[PDB]
């Protein structure tokens, strides 16, 4: 803790002698023009001092050391090392101050994309989106990052990751009352899952959500939509989702609050309802 802090001070001295190496580059490298390996080992000692700071729990200092090492190392060579240093700096910045982590991760995104490795690019896009969501309140940037990551994943035929990202995007859009995109995504994911034998059980839930979203926009067209879903999937009426939706819509034909209240309480009597469904029902049934 404190002796490790003494060695962290020694690492600050290591950064000071790295500045001495920069002074060498400035003045003495004229006679040491061939000392490129000297710059390489300067970057190495930079990284070691940054690791020492990381052990010292000096997150800001470790991140600054990582950023300096990344900037010095990206001398138009060893691009992957610079990108790795930038993502390490972002990870160090994940806690404490993550704002600059966003910019560093964007630079790493640009570099990795320049290489063309779409998997890591989409992974970092999801990372920045989730840190945005859990730290900042802006959602439009998060939804754009989710869209870009899902497109990248779908480009390489990675259907599952793109489908889950699009499901989250549809849920967020429904929260932001953009129901056309939500219903489109839910229908697409349901029809895709139903096609394979391994993903036929989940379909019901998706349909439910889609139906609800549709029932939010047009009440009359809700009957046509539910009939279309029923005929598309003969085994959709049996499940409790279709029965409950039918009960709700047939009760809404007459202005009787008691019916829908009892129905929702009974459905909740068998399992707890999440925040999304509870809020959606409360908002929609108000009128």
């Amino acid at each position: 803790g404190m002796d490790t802090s003494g060695k962290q001070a020694e690492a600050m001295a290591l950064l000071a002698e790295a500045e001495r190496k920069v002074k060498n580059s400035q003045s003495f490298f004229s006679g040491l023009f061939g000392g490129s390996s000297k710059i390489e080992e300067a970057c190495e000692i930079y990284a070691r001092a940054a690791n020492m700071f990381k052990m010292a729990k000096n997150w800001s200092a470790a991140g600054n050391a990582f950023c300096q090492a990344a900037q010095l190392h990206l001398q138009l060579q060893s691009k992957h090392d610079a990108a790795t240093c930038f993502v390490d700096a972002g990870n160090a910045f994940k806690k404490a101050d993550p704002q600059e982590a966003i910019n560093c991760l964007m630079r790493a995104i640009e570099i990795y994309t320049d290489m063309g490795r779409f998997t890591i690019a989409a992974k970092h896009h999801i990372s920045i989106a989730e840190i945005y969501e859990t730290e900042l309140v802006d959602v439009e940037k998060a939804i754009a990052h989710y869209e870009q990551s899902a497109d990248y994943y779908k480009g390489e035929e990675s259907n599952s990751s793109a489908n889950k990202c699009l499901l989250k995007v549809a849920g967020y859009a429904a929260q932001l009352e953009q129901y056309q995109k939500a219903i489109d995504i839910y229908e697409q994911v349901g029809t895709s899952a139903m096609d394979s034998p391994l993903l036929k059980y989940s379909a019901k839930d998706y349909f439910f959500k889609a139906a609800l979203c549709h029932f939010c926009i047009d009440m009359l067209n809700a009957k046509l939509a539910v009939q279309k879903y029923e005929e598309l999937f003969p085994a959709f009426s049996d499940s409790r989702e279709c029965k409950l939706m039918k009960k709700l819509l047939e009760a809404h034909e007459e202005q009787n609050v008691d019916s829908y209240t009892e129905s929702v309480k009974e459905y909740d009597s068998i399992s707890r309802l999440d925040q999304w469904l509870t809020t959606m029902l409360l908002r929609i049934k108000k009128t």
Partner: protein, 105 residues
């Protein structure tokens, strides 16, 4: 107007107009007393009478709840409204039979 123009479904602005069974339109679009044909599909065509109300936005034809239920119209949808002329010697109404019942139980 004569040939037909695209218009947007709207809610009836006032209950009093909802009692007139008239497709309420803005003053800038048509004149009161005109009869127009609402088109939603090649087979589904209906005819309404136009009444002018200040609150109606131009380019939208307001329909009361009974009209929406009868025509299956959705607010905010697109329809094609054209001017409809009644042959007074052939289309004039001589005798009606209608079904009337309490609106609210």
């Amino acid at each position: 107007n004569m040939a037909g123009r695209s218009m947007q479904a709207a809610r009836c602005p006032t209950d009093e107009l909802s009692l007139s069974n008239c497709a309420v339109v803005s003053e800038k679009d048509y004149q009161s007393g005109q009869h127009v044909i609402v088109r939603t599909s090649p087979n589904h065509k209906y005819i309404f009478t136009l009444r002018t109300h200040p609150s109606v936005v131009p380019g939208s034809v307001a329909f009361s709840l009974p009209q929406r239920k009868w025509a299956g119209l959705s607010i905010g949808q697109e329809i094609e409204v054209a001017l409809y002329s009644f042959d007074k010697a052939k289309q004039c109404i001589g005798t009606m039979t209608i079904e009337i019942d309490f609106l609210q139980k």
